[PDB]
């Protein structure tokens, strides 16, 4: 009963000056001590920012003379205005409340989930979709595998669900791919019961969020 | 009185102004001063007073003012922006209103350029809109360029028709002028006194 | 300031009869009113102004009067040619130009039934995974007609959506367009589809209704 | 000979710049009371603002200090400098001349025929078409109905022709309608003779004006 959702993300050319909107429920975010806290992809964690509740603020110094907080205290939202970047700020930014939970000490206690940011430029584009049909050369003995191939896309954050989110067994959504094009592409694939080849429904639906893709593709067997 | 679009101007000269018995006579709806604060008018001494007169509507008294906009004081009065003087008014239906409309009172809806301060333009020509020319003729973007209050004792408060008067006090560069009062007691005799003749 | 209300809000017109329309104000005006008339999609026109003197292009119809509070537009009846939409404006020295809200009109044809019809979904559709299923009811005088969609005879709820067109400027009729929307794994489940019109001109509903996958 | 077109509209995010340009003919706008007049959808109209014909710029007090209005005297274009929306300016914006017409009062006289500006953000998205067959379903003795169905698009000025403009008799388009989806749909129909079912030329034309589709539909009775 308290996570804080951020708004934001999407692609960036290096300069750009986009700002999120971390909106919180369930507490004040003009009494408690909010902080950022980013990581780059396959890297550590490392500390961003942090306001106090009376008005003052604290950088990382690597980000510092750059980077901006602030809060709405009607709204419960909390700001970071980030501007003139680098091309090195491609990290997952999370939110997180820092609150005692001792005699002395202090931690973070209720984090947010994260949100992309990625900078490059080269555009942005949607995904291209076809269905990876189940075959024999995929069927052995009591079960057979179909899946959905979405390729050649740039903006990272992309999801295909299986059934509107119906199947949960079998599902596996494999690691997108970088390409020499510099586009990402990826296949998630799922077994489903060789009796069941063409019997039940199997659709994926592709949502691309950066944009606003949103496509359902039925996978059936090989003609 | 005067119309909008032709003020008067009438040029006070060396006398004794009483600007008490104005600033006291509670008739005035809007008393503004603002180069020198009322009260202080019958203590100082200027070279000239100038009175401007006109007669506009009601809710048009707050162009009469340094540094506004709209159809008066863009092309019809234009006051400086280091203005000096004061600014009357008082309402006047039922000396300038009459039934059935009183269409004797005009002011001027289009011009080329705004006016310079205190500048005056009483001509009559039909203004140009468009790109087209007009030869002296009316028609579409081709207007006359005056229209007339049509007042009436029935309208509403500021559509009834309010009479104002603009003193503006110069002061150029000569020996002295007009100046307020010099109020005077009695002469004592035969008592040690302190004395200013 | 001041707001002016206008009374009658979107009466019934018959032909060869009279309208007025009604507003009045706040602390008066004189003679500062023009009114307008917009169409159902086109831009406002002006055919009154000062509070009478008729626009070079008005015809000998649509009168107004009133002077002081109280402005009175009329019309020698109503002409087919109308259900518009009619605005009163004032205005002062001081910027400013408070649009009053407005009526509309309308007509008194006779009684007209529905043409009914039923499309089926476009086979390109349904490899998109969605089926849509339009049935329109076509020119109509009385607008408060019922669709009701059935699919194998249950009664659809909350699936459809409708919308109506401007009466008509020619004949004062209405036309009506209701989508039934399914997915496609939905609509194979079942066979008929049905679209049943209950309308005054009927004496009984009628039901035009299609068979999924009959050629 | 004095209709001025607005160029502008297109959807937007709340925070935007756009800005519309208000082009005339026939007269001068350096020498007019030029004005900006919008309305809301299903409601009363609304004054904007005003521009005197020596500088001066008036606004409605609910839109000030958040617009601006300027005239090219060389160009004969008038621009509604529009910024940082709050997403309830979503209307129809007209332009005006102001000319008196009377020995005592003034007048708005000549229009623009209205330019549709829409804001939440939502991006926008594409129309997809079908054609709606004449059927005897649709068939009543004379005549029979056939159509085309538009659908799922956001942006919403969408319009879609018979023939090129060719048939005027019978085609009626009914308002679009906004689905949960967020997204628009409508479908426009037109009655033939049913001597006529498949013998002449009935061709859908799709544009789409934010965008830059065009698509032509041909609607055949059913197979």
């Given at each position: 009963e308290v996570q804080l959702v951020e708004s934001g993300g999407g692609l960036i050319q290096p300069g750009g000056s986009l700002r999120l909107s971390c909106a919180a429920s369930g507490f004040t975010v003009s009494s408690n001590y909010m902080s950022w806290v980013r990581q780059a992809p396959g890297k550590g964690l490392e500390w961003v920012s942090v306001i106090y509740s009376g008005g003052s603020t604290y950088y990382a110094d690597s980000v510092k003379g750059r980077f901006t907080i602030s809060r709405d205290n009607s709204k419960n939202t909390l700001y970071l205005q980030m501007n003139s970047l680098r091309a090195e700020d491609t990290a997952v930014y999370y939110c997180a409340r820092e609150g005692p939970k001792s005699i002395t000490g202090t931690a973070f206690d209720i984090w947010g989930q994260g949100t992309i940011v990625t900078v490059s430029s080269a555009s942005t584009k949607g995904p291209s979709v076809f269905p990876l049909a189940p075959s024999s050369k995929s069927t052995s003995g009591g079960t057979a595998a179909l899946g959905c191939l979405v390729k050649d896309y740039f903006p990272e954050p992309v999801t295909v669900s299986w059934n509107s989110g119906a199947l949960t067994s079998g599902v596996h959504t494999f690691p997108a791919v970088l390409q020499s094009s510099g586009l990402y592409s990826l296949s998630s694939v799922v077994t489903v019961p060789s009796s069941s080849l063409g019997t039940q429904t199997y659709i994926c639906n592709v949502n691309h969020k950066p944009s606003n893709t949103k496509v359902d593709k039925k996978v059936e067997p090989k003609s | 009185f005067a119309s909008v679009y032709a003020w008067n101007r009438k040029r006070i000269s060396n006398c004794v102004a009483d600007y008490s018995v104005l600033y006291n006579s509670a008739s005035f709806s809007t008393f503004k001063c603002y180069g020198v604060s009322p009260t202080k008018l019958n203590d100082l001494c200027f070279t000239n007073v100038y009175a401007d007169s006109f007669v506009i509507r009601?809710?048009?008294?707050?162009?009469?003012?340094?540094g506004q906009t709209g159809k008066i004081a863009d092309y019809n009065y234009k006051l400086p922006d280091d203005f000096t003087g004061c600014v009357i008014a008082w309402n006047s239906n039922n000396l300038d209103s009459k039934v059935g409309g009183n269409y004797n009172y005009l002011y001027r809806l289009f011009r080329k350029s705004n006016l310079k301060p205190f500048e005056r333009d009483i001509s009559t020509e039909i203004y140009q809109a468009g790109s087209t020319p007009c030869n002296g003729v009316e028609g579409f973007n081709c207007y006359f360029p005056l229209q007339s209050y049509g007042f009436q004792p029935t309208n509403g408060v500021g559509y009834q028709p309010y009479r104002v008067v603009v003193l503006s006090f110069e002061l150029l560069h000569a020996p002295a002028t007009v100046c307020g009062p010099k109020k005077s007691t009695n002469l004592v005799k035969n008592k040690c006194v302190n004395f200013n003749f | 300031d001041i707001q002016m209300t206008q009374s009658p809000s979107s009466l019934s017109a018959s032909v060869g009869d009279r309208v007025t329309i009604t507003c009045q104000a706040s602390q008066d005006i004189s003679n500062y009113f023009n009114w307008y008339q917009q169409k159902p999609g086109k831009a406002p026109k002006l055919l009154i102004y000062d509070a009478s003197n008729l626009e070079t292009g008005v015809p000998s119809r649509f009168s107004g009067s009133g002077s002081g509070t109280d402005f009175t537009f009329t019309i020698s009846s109503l002409q087919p040619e109308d259900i518009a939409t009619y605005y009163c404006q004032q205005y002062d020295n001081l910027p400013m130009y408070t649009f009053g809200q407005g009526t509309k009109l309308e007509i008194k044809r006779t009684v007209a039934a529905p043409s009914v019809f039923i499309f089926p979904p476009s086979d390109e559709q349904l490899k998109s995974g969605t089926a849509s299923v339009v049935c329109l009811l076509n020119n109509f005088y009385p607008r408060e007609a019922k669709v009701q969609w059935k699919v194998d005879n249950a009664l659809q709820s909350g699936n459809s959506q409708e919308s109506v067109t401007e009466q008509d400027s020619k004949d004062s009729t209405y036309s009506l367009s209701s989508t039934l929307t399914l997915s496609k794994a939905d609509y194979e489940k079942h066979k008929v589809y049905a679209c049943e019109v209950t309308h005054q001109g009927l004496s009984s509903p009628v039901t035009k209704s299609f068979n999924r996958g009959e050629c």
């Open positions: - | 009601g809710d048009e008294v707050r162009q009469i003012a340094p | -």
